[PDB]
Amino acid sequence: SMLGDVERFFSKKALEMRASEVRELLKLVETSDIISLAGGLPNPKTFPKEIIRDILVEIMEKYADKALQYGTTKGFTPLRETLMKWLGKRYGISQDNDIMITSGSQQALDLIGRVFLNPGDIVVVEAPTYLAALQAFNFYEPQYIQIPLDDEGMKVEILEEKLKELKSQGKKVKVVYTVPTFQNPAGVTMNEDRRKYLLELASEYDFIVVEDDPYGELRYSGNPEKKIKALDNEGRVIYLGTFSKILAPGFRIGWMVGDPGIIRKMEIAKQSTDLCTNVFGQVVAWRYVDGGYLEKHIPEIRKFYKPRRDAMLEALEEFMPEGVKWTKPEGGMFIWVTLPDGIDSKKMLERAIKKGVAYVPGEAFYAHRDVKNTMRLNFTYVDEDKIMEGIKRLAETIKEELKA
Amino acid sequence: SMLGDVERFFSKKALEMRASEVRELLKLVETSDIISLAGGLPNPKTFPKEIIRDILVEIMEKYADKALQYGTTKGFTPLRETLMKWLGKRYGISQDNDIMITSGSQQALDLIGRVFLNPGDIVVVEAPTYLAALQAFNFYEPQYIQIPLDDEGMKVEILEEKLKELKSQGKKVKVVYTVPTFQNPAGVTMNEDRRKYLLELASEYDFIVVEDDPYGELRYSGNPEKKIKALDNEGRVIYLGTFSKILAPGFRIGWMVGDPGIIRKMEIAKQSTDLCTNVFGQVVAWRYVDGGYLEKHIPEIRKFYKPRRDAMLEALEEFMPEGVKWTKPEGGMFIWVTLPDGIDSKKMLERAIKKGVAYVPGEAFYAHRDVKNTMRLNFTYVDEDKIMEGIKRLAETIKEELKA
Ligand SMILES: Cc1ncc(COP(=O)(O)O)c(CN)c1O
Ligand SMILES: Cc1ncc(COP(=O)(O)O)c(CN)c1O
Ligand SMILES: Nc1ccccc1C(=O)CC(=O)C(=O)O
Ligand SMILES: Nc1ccccc1C(=O)CC(=O)C(=O)O
Ligand SMILES: O=C(O)c1cc(O)c2ccccc2n1
Ligand SMILES: N[C@@H](CCC(=O)O)C(=O)O
Numbered sequence: 001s002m003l004g005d006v007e008r009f010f011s012k013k014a015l016e017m018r019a020s021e022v023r024e025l026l027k028l029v030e031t032s033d034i035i036s037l038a039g040g041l042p043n044p045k046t047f048p049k050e051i052i053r054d055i056l057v058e059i060m061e062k063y064a065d066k067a068l069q070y071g072t073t074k075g076f077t078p079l080r081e082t083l084m085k086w087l088g089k090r091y092g093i094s095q096d097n098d099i100m101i102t103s104g105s106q107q108a109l110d111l112i113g114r115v116f117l118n119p120g121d122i123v124v125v126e127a128p129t130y131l132a133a134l135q136a137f138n139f140y141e142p143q144y145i146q147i148p149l150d151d152e153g154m155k156v157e158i159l160e161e162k163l164k165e166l167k168s169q170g171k172k173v174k175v176v177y178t179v180p181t182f183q184n185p186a187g188v189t190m191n192e193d194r195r196k197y198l199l200e201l202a203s204e205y206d207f208i209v210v211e212d213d214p215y216g217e218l219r220y221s222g223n224p225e226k227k228i229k230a231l232d233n234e235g236r237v238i239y240l241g242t243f244s245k246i247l248a249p250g251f252r253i254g255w256m257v258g259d260p261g262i263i264r265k266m267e268i269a270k271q272s273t274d275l276c277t278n279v280f281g282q283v284v285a286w287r288y289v290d291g292g293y294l295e296k297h298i299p300e301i302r303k304f305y306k307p308r309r310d311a312m313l314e315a316l317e318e319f320m321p322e323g324v325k326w327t328k329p330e331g332g333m334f335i336w337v338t339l340p341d342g343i344d345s346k347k348m349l350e351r352a353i354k355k356g357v358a359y360v361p362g363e364a365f366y367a368h369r370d371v372k373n374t375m376r377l378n379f380t381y382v383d384e385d386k387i388m389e390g391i392k393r394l395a396e397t398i399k400e401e402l403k404a
Numbered sequence: 405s406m407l408g409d410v411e412r413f414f415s416k417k418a419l420e421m422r423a424s425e426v427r428e429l430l431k432l433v434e435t436s437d438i439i440s441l442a443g444g445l446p447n448p449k450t451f452p453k454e455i456i457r458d459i460l461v462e463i464m465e466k467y468a469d470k471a472l473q474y475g476t477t478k479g480f481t482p483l484r485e486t487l488m489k490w491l492g493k494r495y496g497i498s499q500d501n502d503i504m505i506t507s508g509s510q511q512a513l514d515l516i517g518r519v520f521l522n523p524g525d526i527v528v529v530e531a532p533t534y535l536a537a538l539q540a541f542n543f544y545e546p547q548y549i550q551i552p553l554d555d556e557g558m559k560v561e562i563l564e565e566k567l568k569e570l571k572s573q574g575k576k577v578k579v580v581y582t583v584p585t586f587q588n589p590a591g592v593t594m595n596e597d598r599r600k601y602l603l604e605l606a607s608e609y610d611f612i613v614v615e616d617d618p619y620g621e622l623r624y625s626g627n628p629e630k631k632i633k634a635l636d637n638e639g640r641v642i643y644l645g646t647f648s649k650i651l652a653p654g655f656r657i658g659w660m661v662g663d664p665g666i667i668r669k670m671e672i673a674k675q676s677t678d679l680c681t682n683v684f685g686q687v688v689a690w691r692y693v694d695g696g697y698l699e700k701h702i703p704e705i706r707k708f709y710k711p712r713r714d715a716m717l718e719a720l721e722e723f724m725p726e727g728v729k730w731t732k733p734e735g736g737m738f739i740w741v742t743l744p745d746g747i748d749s750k751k752m753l754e755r756a757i758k759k760g761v762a763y764v765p766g767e768a769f770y771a772h773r774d775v776k777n778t779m780r781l782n783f784t785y786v787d788e789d790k791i792m793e794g795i796k797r798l799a800e801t802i803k804e805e806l807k808a
């Protein structure tokens with residue numbers, strides 16, 4: 001810096017902000033010849049570019065001033081209306097909720113942290129959970145309680161145990177954050193019973209549930225789950241959706257649906273952070289839903305990604321040595337791998353890159369960073385032939401790691 | 405709310421967020437048939453819609469995957485590079501600075517608050533200043549020091565006097581926030597001597613200057629000022645620009661240029677707030693600048709607004725009674741009016757609306773809400789015949805107000 005010790009101007013929270021060594025390493029990896037399984041990007045082959053071109057034309061013909069002018073903080077009315085009708089019909093979400101458009105779901109997470117969290121307030125997350133949610137919430141200094149996943153998602157029975165223990169200490173949880181369908185990073189889905197059990201606990205212990213659902217339309221097998229929000233009789237759930245993995249991420253348009261008192265406060269918090277979400281992309285998203293193109297395109301996204309999931313699951317079964325385990329997602333973008341014998345997957349990353357493969361070590365996905373033997377793999381966006389070769393390279397790296 | 409006392413879940417800062425009575429009133433006014441001079445919107449007649457259509461075509465042909473995929477937090481590299489070349493050539497801003505793309509300048513103000521402000525830190529603003537900057541920074545709980553404007557912008561001598569008084573209390577200012585060209589709301593411009601004086605004080609007292617410049621290209625008379633940033637040999641200035649008033653606000657694209665140590669911290673802070681600014685609008689903006697269209701379009705924006713500033717200045721001179729004073733902007737969107745005899749312009753707004761005219765009362769533009777006799781008028785976004793009729797209605801409202 002030209003200011004010398006620029007840190008002298010920084011706030012306390014800014015002084016705690018750091019670049020991640022692993023993040024920086026993976027950025028460098030993505031530009032080289034290594035087969036990276038570390039990405040969290042959707043595949044541009046799934047972006048509906050012809051439909052988008054037709055919508056851009058339509059916008060310049062018919063809606064140009066609306067798309068180009070400042071918008072309201074809450075969002076473009078027609079997009080709000082179209083999303084609530086979609087959400088109603090498709091998922092059974094109740095029309096008594098209100099809706100706000102956000103600059104991606106990522107912004108929704110930051111607003112959640114702003115509107116609900118005082119320093120020390122307790123937030124329950126899954127272990128693992130979405131890394132950037134931990135990052136959004138950490139600005140507001142919560143305390144976390146981690147609830148392990150199994151193959152049927154959050155172990156809600158362990159959450160009950162922890163709630164009773166917190167109660168015995170005169171403490172309570174304020175928010176439970178869940179990514180309950182095709183989780184980033186674990187790939188697994190909370191079953192129906194657990195969703196209903198979560199909502200009983202939310203009533204009994206008086207907390208808010210944030211359901212973050214980017215991936216529910218990217219279903220490749222099985223039958224559709226009930227959204228937690230569709231079971232929410234009390235108005236305790238805030239449901240987050242996004243166009244990032246159903247349209248394209250580049251428009252940065254997401255939505256937040258919940259109790260109108262909650263949404264009103266979120267609108268005021270958002271006003272100061274950005275004035276509105278970009279209206280141009282909101283009009284694109286409105287045409288995409290209201291014109292029926294979303295409903296038509298979803299099955300093409302699904303046909304695209306399914307064989308990539310399946311190739312990766314075949315390669316793991318064929319190549320991985322005994323002791324290695326992995327999730328079996330019904331949808332989404334990720335498979336999550338657990339190593340035997342106490343291998344530390346972060347230390348192992350060095351070895352993996354030297355054998356021509358990369359993955360995200362799972363440690364940063366745990367709020368307590370306490371689990372060291374996990375990895376997140378992505379199947380959406382390496383070449384579909386590079387999945388087999390990637391998984392083989394990873395398998396051989398694990399074999400080498402396991403010996404003397 | 406269906407949760408009853410939903411406030412039980414809200415953070416301390418959320419409990420102190422409130423809707424503004426006047427802002428809500430003015431929203432209702434814009435719907436109706438009142439002549440509103442209260443807007444802060446640019447006129448869609450200045451949006452370069454043909455150029456935008458050609459660029460959208462171009463993007464879908466050549467840049468579709470870049471425009472539709474997630475971007476880096478810092479911004480789209482070609483827009484960053486083209487902006488730095490533009491700012492170098494046009495304004496003489498040094499290439500030693502770094503640049504981050506923001507989701508409007510508004511987001512830049514929130515990030516400045518996050519990165520620099522601990523509760524109690526002292527921020528100097530102009531009196532009046534940009535309302536949404538007060539609102540952005542208020543989340544971070546600064547103390548403000550207010551420096552009056554005169555017709556040549558911030559009275560930097562008064563800022564020296566206050567810096568000396570603070571120093572005698574063992575205290576110092578962290579950030580001076582200035583909107584030094586065609587201010588929103590006052591319309592006036594800090595002269596060159598004061599710019600240089602500000603930067604000497606910045607050195608002597610060790611603070612950072614945030615220069616927020618949405619309007620500098622909307623110049624209708626006079627010669628171009630030197631940007632404070634162009635005079636900044638120490639790297640103490642963070643320069644904020646936006647495409648809102650020179651392309652269209654709907655893309656929500658702005659930029660922040662400053663010391664690389666500062667910009668690195670801003671990038672980390674942003675990452676968790678929104679991942680990236682919408683890439684699709686960043687590509688549009690990149691073509692608009694690099695393609696030479698910004699430079700061609702600026703003179704058409706200026707030709708459009710100039711006669712509207714002039715009509716409003718003519719009407720005020722012809723209609724306003726004695727004692728009323730107003731600023732005489734060389735550019736931008738606003739003219740600022742001062743009422744005599746202790747009229748409270750907030751109380752007078754009711755009277756004005758009954759006579760078919762509206763404006764923004766000036767009180768909320770003061771950090772200390774202590775000046776009661778001012779008003780912000782906008783000339784960009786009506787009609788341009790309703791300007792004369794609006795100002796006449798306003799003049800008669802003031803005459804009646806001045807009577808018992
Ligand atoms: C769990 C989760 N939450 C939210 C996000 C952030 O998404 P957005 O692009 O909407 O900001 C993602 C990525 N699709 C995610 O995996
Ligand atoms: C002084 C000032 N700063 C910031 C902004 C917000 O601009 P943006 O659309 O880039 O968020 C405005 C509105 N043009 C403004 O007048
Ligand atoms: N590779 C990605 C692409 C898009 C969103 C997240 C990811 C990630 O998994 C991490 C990342 O770099 C980020 O979030 O900014
Ligand atoms: N609308 C805005 C957009 C950006 C910044 C200020 C404002 C306003 O001041 C409000 C306004 O224009 C209006 O209600 O017409
Ligand atoms: O005079 C007012 O009471 C007033 C007027 C405004 O335009 C405001 C905008 C934002 C916040 C508070 C506000 N208060
Ligand atoms: N290890 C993280 C980087 C951030 C962190 O370590 O906290 C990742 O793989 O994305």
Ligand SMILES: O=C(O)CCC(=O)C(=O)O
Nearest residue numbers: 213214215216217241242
């Ligand atoms: O998850 C999907 O991909 C479908 C729609 C949705 O749930 C969302 O995008 O938020």
Ligand SMILES: O=C(O)CCC(=O)C(=O)O
Nearest residue numbers: 617618619620621645646
């Ligand atoms: O006009 C200027 O001088 C710079 C301000 C500007 O145009 C912008 O922010 O876009």
Ligand SMILES: O=C(O)/C=C/CC(=O)O
Nearest residue numbers: 039040041130131132184
């Ligand atoms: O898909 C994504 O963008 C999320 C990836 C998980 C993370 O690294 O935050």
Ligand SMILES: O=C(O)/C=C/CC(=O)O
Nearest residue numbers: 443444445534535536588
């Ligand atoms: O819209 C603008 O350009 C300025 C608005 C000022 C405000 O009311 O915050």
